[PDB]
Amino acid sequence: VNQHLCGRQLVDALYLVCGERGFFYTP
Amino acid sequence: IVEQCCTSICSLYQLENYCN
């Protein structure tokens, strides 16, 4: 429900905020 | 992340603290 859309927004934001550095996603 | 940025609204620095 809310967590899936929130995590999608989260991943899309981390991509930008990190750039070529990369990020880790742990729900 | 899903506990501190999903309930509240994280800023750009809080999201940058999750940068690998």
Swiss-Prot record, chain B:
Top-level taxon of origin: Eukaryota
The chain's disulfide connectivity reads C5-C10
Q: What is this protein called?
A: Insulin A chain
Portion of the full-length sequence here = 91 to 110 of 110
